[PDB]
Design a protein around this ligand. Sequence first.
Ligand SMILES: *C/C=C(\C)c1ccc(N(C)C)s1
Length: 133
Amino acid sequence: TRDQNGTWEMESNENFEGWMKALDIDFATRKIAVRLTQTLVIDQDGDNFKVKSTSTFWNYDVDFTVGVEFDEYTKSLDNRHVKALVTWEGDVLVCVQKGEKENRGWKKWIEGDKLYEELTCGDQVCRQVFKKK
Ligand SMILES: *C/C=C(\C)c1ccc(N(C)C)s1
């Protein structure tokens, strides 16, 4: 199941604060951001993806082509330069962001009408579940 198209509304969020701490996000931002429900909008056509992560506090958008490395500035998240690559491991979409932080990236996959996400950085893992709206 590779079709991740849709507007995805958060149902569950685990260890989001630990992931933000691993990125060195400042105290004030974390305390506010950890409270918030997230939305994920994914536009997927072949290898081309357009991903938007939103809350009332942020809007993080990235476009990429599966299998094509891209240099990336992580902008309002943590203002770092990484070399990013998104690929398929079966039906798990896997992103690796090479740079200052170890084990940095994410994984997304579908189960039923839900989208599961792992956000990793350092020794931290944030687990999220979204429902298709
Ligand atoms: C596929 C998920 C992303 C590209 C995300 C970028 C920032 C996120 N959060 C702050 C939750 S998710």
